[PDB]
Design a protein around this motif. Structure first.
Motif, PDB file in Angstrom:
ATOM      1  N   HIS A  54       0.843  -1.187   0.000  1.00  0.00           N
ATOM      2  CA  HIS A  54       0.000   0.000   0.000  1.00  0.00           C
ATOM      3  C   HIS A  54       0.883   1.243   0.000  1.00  0.00           C
ATOM      4  N   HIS A  99      -5.831  -2.271   8.131  1.00  0.00           N
ATOM      5  CA  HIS A  99      -6.436  -1.093   8.743  1.00  0.00           C
ATOM      6  C   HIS A  99      -5.728  -0.752  10.050  1.00  0.00           C
ATOM      7  N   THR A 117      -6.129   2.615   6.225  1.00  0.00           N
ATOM      8  CA  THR A 117      -5.846   1.838   5.028  1.00  0.00           C
ATOM      9  C   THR A 117      -6.697   0.572   4.956  1.00  0.00           C
ATOM     10  N   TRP A 118      -6.906   0.102   3.726  1.00  0.00           N
ATOM     11  CA  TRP A 118      -7.581  -1.162   3.480  1.00  0.00           C
ATOM     12  C   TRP A 118      -6.904  -1.859   2.309  1.00  0.00           C
ATOM     13  N   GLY A 120      -6.377  -3.813  -1.348  1.00  0.00           N
ATOM     14  CA  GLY A 120      -6.609  -3.252  -2.665  1.00  0.00           C
ATOM     15  C   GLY A 120      -6.170  -1.816  -2.798  1.00  0.00           C
ATOM     16  N   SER A 147      -6.739   0.708  -0.844  1.00  0.00           N
ATOM     17  CA  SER A 147      -7.890   1.563  -0.597  1.00  0.00           C
ATOM     18  C   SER A 147      -7.867   2.098   0.833  1.00  0.00           C
ATOM     19  N   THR A 148      -8.979   2.705   1.244  1.00  0.00           N
ATOM     20  CA  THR A 148      -9.173   3.196   2.602  1.00  0.00           C
ATOM     21  C   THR A 148     -10.629   2.972   2.970  1.00  0.00           C
ATOM     22  N   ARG A 149     -10.895   2.861   4.271  1.00  0.00           N
ATOM     23  CA  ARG A 149     -12.273   2.849   4.748  1.00  0.00           C
ATOM     24  C   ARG A 149     -12.304   3.158   6.235  1.00  0.00           C
TER      25      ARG A 149
END
Length: 279
Positions: free
Chosen positions: A46, A72, A211-212, A214, A216-218
């Motif tokens: 990431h 995360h 962070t997540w 792929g 990504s973030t969530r």
């Protein structure tokens, strides 16, 4: 240093008041410390980890995080945007499968792994372990957490998400580690947070952006999210030389914001993690 428009939890840990959005911290940023994230793994590629994250151990067919939970939590410890200690080294130990589940025997092995593996890493400012996991009471699980702490690692563990007394959960109930409850952006105890005399500290745990997988973030919620705030704070304070792995939980409690959380049951500490950074 000042990070504008930071996630609320980062802003909270550097503030004497809720409701602000800038995170203030010493630029040393946990450099020279190491944090082990014992979880579902870490997506080390990431961009948010900047090459500072790596998987060091798995008990499954892959070391990749196929869940997101570990990524995360690692992001809250040490990612560039979402992390408390933005220059720490992150080491992933995958004790949980991609469904987020793990046997206690595997979890125990992972803790003993970290107690030894730190001797293979360069962490001149000290070593922290973040354990956003738990289940029902087990003396063997508690003993493993106690060994990890005794070996010279600041162990931070989630209190659990049962809205119940954490004395009945492990490793939450181990006295010698740092047991972390969760709060929300209005300084309320998170609705799901466990409580009780075994808790040492609260950290931000409701609606935490990180962070997540792929790339990504969530935003998710849990005592799993509060724990890495405290782990990253410990690494940051150890880099500053203000405390040590053996004393960091106590130091964080000593320096916490006190009496500011609502819905704290009688007999549970009213202490919110705080970096006491004066810009």
């Amino acid at each position: 240093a000042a990070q504008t428009n930071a996630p609320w939890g980062l802003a909270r840990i550097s503030s004497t008041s809720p409701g602000t959005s800038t995170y203030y911290y010493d630029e040393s940023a946990g450099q020279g410390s190491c944090v082990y994230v014992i979880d579902t793994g870490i997506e080390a590629s990431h961009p948010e980890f900047e090459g500072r994250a790596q998987m060091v151990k798995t008990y499954y067919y892959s070391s990749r995080d196929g869940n997101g939970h570990g990524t995360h939590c690692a992001g809250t410890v040490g990612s560039r945007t979402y992390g408390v200690a933005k220059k720490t080294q992150l080491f992933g130990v995958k004790v949980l499968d991609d469904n987020g589940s793990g046997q206690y025997s595997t979890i125990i092995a992972g803790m003993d792994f970290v107690a030894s593996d730190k001797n293979n890493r360069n962490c001149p400012k000290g070593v922290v372990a973040s354990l956003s996991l738990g289940g029902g009471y087990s003396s063997s699980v508690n003993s493993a957490a106690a060994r990890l702490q005794s070996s010279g690692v600041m162990v931070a563990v989630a209190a659990g998400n049962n809205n119940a007394d954490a004395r009945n959960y492990s490793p939450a109930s181990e006295p010698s580690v740092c047991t972390v409850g969760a709060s929300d952006r209005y300084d309320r105890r998170s609705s799901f947070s466990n409580y009780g005399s075994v808790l040492d500290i609260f950290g931000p745990g409701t609606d935490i952006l990180s962070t997540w997988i792929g790339g990504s973030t969530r935003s998710i919620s849990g005592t799993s999210m509060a724990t890495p705030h405290v782990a990253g704070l410990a690494a940051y304070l150890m880099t500053l030389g203000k405390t040590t792995a053996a004393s960091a939980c106590r130091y964080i409690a000593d320096t916490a914001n006190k009496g500011d959380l609502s819905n704290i049951p009688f007999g549970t500490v009213n202490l919110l993690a705080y970096n006491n950074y004066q810009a």
